[PDB]
Symmetry: C6
């Protein structure tokens, strides 16, 4: 349903955010 759909959206965005933050963390080493 709508809630599930949004949660999948939220889950996809958090995966992207995690990836970007991993990238940032790697850059600041360095």
């Amino acid at each position: 349903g709508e809630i599930a759909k949004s949660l999948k959206e939220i889950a996809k965005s958090l995966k992207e955010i995690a990836w970007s933050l991993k990238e940032i963390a790697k850059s600041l080493k360095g």
Copy 2:
């Protein structure tokens, strides 16, 4: 419903946040 509306609202900001962090990740390379 309200939860659903809030969840759509929640999903949009996280897209903005994801984009900004992509930009930030790009600047820092």
Copy 3:
């Protein structure tokens, strides 16, 4: 209910966070 109330709070905070990250992204371009 409490859950809805909390979700509206959560939504508001995420808007503040998104805004701050836009600012941060801008500063780091220079």
Copy 4:
């Protein structure tokens, strides 16, 4: 219930995160 309790904690933490990100934005100006 437990879900409601957790969401309140989540809201509280997001307020803290928001405050910190404002401080971070100020520093980078």
Copy 5:
């Protein structure tokens, strides 16, 4: 339940995230 269990994990993670961002904010002052 499974949902409640996940929310506690999420709540725990957000506390850690808040803590880390506070440390980051402090470091960026000087």
Copy 6:
């Protein structure tokens, strides 16, 4: 169900995010 699955994904992502932010905080000290 799907909601629980998404929340597990969300919980997993926030753990990653928390971890990356610790790395970033450590780096800014340093």
